[model samples]
Target: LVGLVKVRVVRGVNLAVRDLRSSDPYVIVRMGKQKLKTRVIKKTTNPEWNDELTLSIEDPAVPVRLEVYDKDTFIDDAMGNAELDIRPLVEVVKMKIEGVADNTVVKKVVPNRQNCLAEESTIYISEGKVKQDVVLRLRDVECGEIELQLQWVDIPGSKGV
Candidate 1:
C-alpha cells in the first residue's frame, strides 16, 4: 500500500485522573506491530500535544488503537482507551474522485453501538489529500474524550518499486 496516514494528537477533554497528587498525560497510538506516542505533559489531565505521527498504511484492516496514560517515573498508569477504524476513509479513496475543490466533505461516518464515537466523523479532501477529523470517547473509564485528525496521502512514486 502506498497510503500514508498522519495522525495529529490534538488534545484531551476531561481525561482520567490516575495519580495521587495529579496525572501526567500522554497518548500512545498502536497499529499492528508499529506504535507511536506523544510527549508527556506533566501535572495535567486536559492536555494538548498537537503532535503529528505519520503511519504507514500497510493494511487498513488493522485497527489503530490509542491509549491514554498517566506518565510516572516508573511504569505509566493507564487512563483511558480509544480506537480508529480507517475503513470508512479507505472506502472513499477507492472511488475515482476527480479534481475537486479543497475542503470538500466527501463522506460521513455515523456513530453506532459498534464503535466509541462521540460524534459523526467526516471524510473529506484538503490540501490535496483525503483527511478526517474525529473525536472518540474514551472507553472503560469514568468520562473522557480523545480528539485527533487523520490525513491520508496516496503516493504516486513507490519507495520499494
Candidate 2:
C-alpha cells in the first residue's frame, strides 16, 4: 500500500506563452493524489528546473502527471501536460519517449537495426550507472526524428522507522 517514487522534473522547452516578450513559467507535478509545484522562472520560453520530487504512492498503478503553466496576475494560463505510467517501474525503471500526436511511432535501438518498443526494447540493471541513446522515428513524417539519453540510477534505502 506504500512505496517511494523519485522523479526529476527536468526541463521544458518551446512552451507556449501569452506574453509578447516572454513568460514566467512554472511546473506542477501530481502523483496519485499528492501534488507539488516548482519555482517560477522569469522571462523565458525554455525553463530548466532540475527539481527533484519524492512521492509516497498508495497504488503503484497510478500515473504521474507533469503540467506547465504561465504565471499571471489575474489567472494562470495552462500550457500542456505530460503523464508517465508507473507500472513499469515495478519491474524495471524506464526512460521512455512518448508522443501525444496521432499516428506517432516510437522505436528503440538494436544490434543491427531498430525496432518498435513493444516488439523489442533494451532494459537493464547496473551496479553503478548506465546511459543509452535511443533514436525514434514518427509515422508518415518527413525527416522527423528524436534522440533521447536515458540514464538509470539506483538509490539505496534505509530501515523503517
Candidate 3:
C-alpha cells in the first residue's frame, strides 16, 4: 500500500499596495540576491480559490522562499490587510517541477461567478526533479505574484494529475 500524507507548511506576510494601476503584478521567490523561482499567484479582483497553487523542488541545498506582487488597480478595499488585497494569498495552483509546470484547474467544477473551492489535491515529484506551480493572479488586472516551496521525500516516486 502507498502511504499518503498532507504536508503542513505555510509562510504568511502583509503587503501594502504602492500602485493601483499596474499590470501583471506578481510575487517572486529569491535566494539571497538571485531569483531562482517565482509564481503568478494573485491579481486585483476575482479572489477565487481556483487560482491557488503549490510548487516543490528536489534540491536541498537551495533555500526556498516567496514574494508577492500585484497590478496597479484602484484599492477597492483598504490597505494593510494583506487578505484584503488577495493578491498574494499562498495556495496550491497546481503540481509540477521547478522549471516544469502545470495548472490546478477545478476538477469538473466551475462557478457561475469567479469559481472557488475548498478542497485538496495531490501532486507527486520523482527523485531528482523540480516543480513550480504557476497561476494567473489577475485575468482582469493581469498583474500577479509567484510563491515557492520545498519538497523532499525519503523515497523516489512519480505521480501527476
Candidate 4:
C-alpha cells in the first residue's frame, strides 16, 4: 500500500475528433491530487506518448484517473476520462512478490483483470517483475482510448520495515 506506483503512458488511439482534420492528443493521469501529462502529439488521431510517470500511493484502495484532452492554442478540450482501481492490483502484487525472492517473481498476471468498462491485460510484470502493460478504454467520452503500463514497486527498506 505504501510504495511507488509506476505508470507508462503508451499511446492514444481514435480519440474524439476536435479539429476539422484531427485532434492534437495528449494524456493526463491523476492519482489522489497529483497529476502528470504526456507530451502533445500534433495533428494526429493516433498519438504515441511512451512517457513514464511515478508516484507514491499511501493507500492502494485509492482509484487512479486517466483523462484525455486535445491541446488547443487557447483552451484544451476534454476527450474523456476513466478510473482504475489499484487495490486489487496492489494486493495481487503483494501476494506475488512480498517475502518472495526477486528471482521467483510472478510473471503471469491475472486473466480476468478487467473491471468496469476498461479493457486490460493480465496484471503480471514482464521479466518476472511487478509490472504489466495495460490498455484502458475511456468511458463517458464520446470516442477515445488510451494504453498504459503499470508497475507496483516495493521499497526495499523503507520506514515501513
TM-score of 3: 0.26
Q: Write the per-residue lDDT of candidate 2 for residues 1-161, one digit (tens) a residue.
A: 34566565556556675567777888777876799887888887777766666666677677666666779998887766555545544444444333344323233334333332212233333323333333333222222222223344444466564
Model 4 misplaced regions, further than 4 Å = 97-117, 158-161
Separately for all candidates shown, the number of backbone clashes (residues 3 or more apart, or on different chains) is 0, 0, 33, 1
Q: Give the candidate number with the greatest lDDT.
A: 1
Each prediction's whole-model lDDT (CA): 0.86, 0.54, 0.29, 0.74
The lDDT ranking, best first, is: 1, 4, 2, 3
Supply candidate 3's per-residue lDDT for 115.
21
Give one digit per residue, the lDDT tens place, for model 4 in 105-160.
Answer: 34333334355334435555443457655667777677767888788777776564
The 10 consecutive residues of candidate 2 with the worst lDDT sum are 138-147
lDDT string for model 3 (1-161, tens) is: 12211112222222334345422334444433444222333533222222223334333333333344444355333221111111111122223234333433322222223422112222324323322222212222223322222232333467652
Please, what are the lDDT tens digits per residue for candidate 1 over residues 31-105?
Answer: 888999999888887898899998898899899999998888788878889788998888877775758888899
